[PDB]
């Protein structure tokens, strides 16, 4: 069964990365591998989903493209990050009722050897700021200023606190704090713009408001941390890790106490998401289940969706920000998995809304490795291990 309304098969191998323009959800960039041979480079494309033909091509990566992001608030830049450690920065123009979006390569840098993720800063005060986490554990924050393309990239921060690979990062809603986690079990929440330090709310390293490591027995998740999310008020951060473990840690408002410890699921928590408007946290696990916790009730278990993606890993969960059906605002969760399926859930109960097939399953060389769904969730664009990009409608 194939439920897609459009597709893109331009990638020669697995597609690992996807990003979406924050103003124009039809503009999507995808990135991945051109093959498993050493002489096979990475490759990215930009698509307009409004068989798809790309409107731009991202070359220059000698290894797989692993991370992509458009900048906030307006998508003035598109940035790619590779397993070669290259960060390539493109300026983005979207004509009013001129024509197709246009892209211009501005700059390339190589601050790390391998980029694991990007996250754009949501602070309205600091437009075109992005963070990345790398295999060397470092976390970098960059600001992009198109004026002076002799140096359009400026370094806001370069943190070297994690030792092992930095697996995930999440900004607080006000964009002043950046929470990152590592394979070495540490959590650091950086005071990116110095505000916390000015209010005497940073730790002894002068850089974080929270720093927790393997030596902290109440916190340590044996086997590593792989996911992180920050609550919509910025009051807490959730970290997810090996063994199905989740830790909830307090943040200063603009701290570092364990507010709850969760272990309903049985294997790696690969994805965490707070609902933007309902008092719930969703967690996706390598064991194929999703668990939903009530954030106003000491993270009491609301529901355990076993076999949400059979016994195949749940790769990503994400709430629909503002669905057209406003009654469901905050309660609609989209998930994707190595079963090759995308699903959407109604989390009001204590619930499958839709499922979209088309990708091969993991055992056939497929699985869904990522997706975007815009603000409304009405179009879902996927990237697959089977080298295909699919478009579904809600």
């Amino acid at each position: 069964e194939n439920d897609s309304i459009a597709y893109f098969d331009g990638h020669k191998d697995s597609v690992f990365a996807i990003a979406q323009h924050p103003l124009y959800p039809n503009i999507v960039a995808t990135g991945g591998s051109e093959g498993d041979a050493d002489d096979a480079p990475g490759k990215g494309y930009v698509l307009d989903i409004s068989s798809l033909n790309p409107i731009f091509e991202i070359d220059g990566h000698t290894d797989s493209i692993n991370a992509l992001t458009f900048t906030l608030p307006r998508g003035d830049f598109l940035v790619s990050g590779g397993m070669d450690g290259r960060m390539r920065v493109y300026a983005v123009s979207v004509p009013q009722n001129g024509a197709l979006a246009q892209f211009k390569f501005l700059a390339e840098s190589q601050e790390t050897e391998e980029i694991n993720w990007f996250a754009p800063c949501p602070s309205p005060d600091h437009p075109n700021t992005i963070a990345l986490g790398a295999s060397d554990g470092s976390v970098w924050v960059f600001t992009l200023d198109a004026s002076d393309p002799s140096n359009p990239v400026q370094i806001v921060q370069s943190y070297f606190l994690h030792t092992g690979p930095c697996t995930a990062g999440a900004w607080s809603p006000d964009g002043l704090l950046l929470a990152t986690v590592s394979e070495d079990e540490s959590l650091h929440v950086y005071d990116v713009f110095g505000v916390a330090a000015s209010k005497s709310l940073v730790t002894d390293n002068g850089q974080t408001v929270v720093s927790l490591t393997n030596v902290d027995q109440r916190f340590a998740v044996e086997g590593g941390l792989f996911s992180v999310a920050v609550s919509p008020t910025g009051a807490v951060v959730a970290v997810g890790g090996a063994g199905g473990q989740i830790k909830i840690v307090g943040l200063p408002r603009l701290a570092g106490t364990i507010l709850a410890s969760l272990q309903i699921q049985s294997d790696n928590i690969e994805s965490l998401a707070f609902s933007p408007s309902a008092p719930i946290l969703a967690a996706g696990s390598t064991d194929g289940s999703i668990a939903v916790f009530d954030t106003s009730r000491s993270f009491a278990l609301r529901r355990h969706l076993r076999g949400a993606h059979a016994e195949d890993p749940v790769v990503k969960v994400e709430f629909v920000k503002s669905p057209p059906n406003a009654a469901m605002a905050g309660w609609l969760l989209t998930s994707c998995g190595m079963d090759g399926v995308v699903r959407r859930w109604d989390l009001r109960g204590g619930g499958l809304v839709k499922e979209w097939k088309g990708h091969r399953s993991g055992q056939e060389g497929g699985g869904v490795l990522g997706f975007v769904q815009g603000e409304t969730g009405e179009r879902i664009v996927t990237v697959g291990d089977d080298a295909v990009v699919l478009v579904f409608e809600a």
């Binding site: 191998d13 692993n66 397993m83 390598t286 890993p313």
Partner: peptide, 12 residues
């Protein structure tokens, strides 16, 4: 080209 760490986590 290589596969990211997370893919190796998913695979078993």
């Amino acid at each position: 080209a290589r596969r990211p760490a997370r893919c190796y986590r998913y695979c078993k």
